[PDB]
């Protein structure tokens, strides 16, 4: 259906939170990779709101501890994903209408993500 749209919109919203945390704890954030269907679209028209697909929070050593990704424009089984490297931790969120951004059945709010990234910073970050 059309929920996809808001999902990408919601996806953009997610990025904001990430950036905010960067200023809070003074930790390095990096834009990892942009959309291929936006680089390699030559004349084809493009309606998506933002051009960024993958980003991450890297520690002082540059090694990431938190990764966030969004599904491409034409792929099947679209989702938004989160991963903690080296910790065997994967989260798979959808956008359910009325509820909001939810990890499966459980809502994914700003506070939950802030806590998760703070835990990763305290635990996994080497320096």
């Amino acid at each position: 259906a059309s929920s996809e749209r808001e999902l990408y919109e919601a996806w953009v919203e997610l990025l904001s939170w990430m950036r905010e945390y960067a200023q809070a704890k003074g930790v390095r954030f990096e834009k990892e990779a942009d959309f291929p269907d936006f680089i390699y679209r030559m004349e084809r028209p493009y309606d998506l709101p933002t051009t960024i697909m993958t980003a991450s929070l890297s520690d002082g050593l540059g090694e990431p501890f938190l990764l966030a990704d969004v599904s491409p424009r034409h792929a099947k089984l679209k989702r938004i994903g989160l991963r903690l490297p080296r910790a065997h931790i994967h989260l798979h969120a959808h956008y359910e209408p009325g509820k909001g951004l939810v990890t499966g059945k459980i809502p994914l709010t700003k506070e939950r993500f802030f806590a998760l990234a703070d835990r990763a910073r305290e635990a996994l970050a080497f320096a």
């Binding site: 990096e30 959309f35 680089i39 679209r41 030559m42 004349e43």
Partner: protein
């Protein structure tokens, strides 16, 4: 066949009194097709990002090896391309260029596309190496044309009109069939 001399005279007379067929360039704009092979242009996405990721594929598809593409690394704060790479130096030797259309064909980001300007006659060899800021879609005219518009004070008048610009030329502003 003595009649044939008089017939020849008669036909030359009929065609004498038929005035029209000719076009008075530069006073009349030449009608060019949309797919015409002209001066290269670099297109930008709607976001304003450049499309050239400096992948030097347009240079390989050159049978003269006339395209020089020095790449460079994007600055995330104020980027130029959409990926992690851009074209620091993008030059074309118009005296080496043969105007195939293979470079437009090989561009995967749609950055390099042939345009419509043909008025690129100039006096010096070293002045016929067109640069990036000499071919960006935002530029209006060819090198001698722009230089004459500056040393003259009169804006550039292109010597062509087209029915439209193709979709591959998104952004390229051109005179369209009489819409203006």
């Amino acid at each position: 066949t003595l009649k044939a001399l008089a017939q020849s005279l008669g036909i030359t007379l009929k065609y004498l009194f038929s005035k029209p067929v000719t076009v008075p360039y530069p006073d009349a704009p030449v009608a060019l097709k949309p797919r015409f092979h002209g001066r290269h242009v670099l297109t930008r996405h709607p976001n304003g990002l450049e499309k050239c990721i400096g992948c030097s594929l347009c240079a390989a598809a050159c049978p003269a090896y006339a395209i020089y593409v020095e790449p460079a690394e994007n600055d995330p704060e104020n980027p130029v391309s959409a990926g992690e790479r851009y074209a620091k130096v993008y030059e074309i030797n118009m005296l080496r260029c043969i105007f195939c259309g293979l470079c437009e064909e090989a561009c995967p980001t749609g950055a390099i596309v042939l345009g419509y300007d043909f008025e690129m006659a100039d006096y010096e060899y070293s002045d016929l190496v067109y640069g990036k800021e000499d071919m960006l879609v935002d530029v209006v005219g060819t090198k001698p044309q722009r230089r004459e518009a500056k040393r003259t004070g009169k804006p550039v008048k292109v010597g062509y009109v087209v029915p439209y610009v193709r979709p591959e030329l998104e952004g390229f502003k051109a005179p369209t069939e009489g819409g203006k």
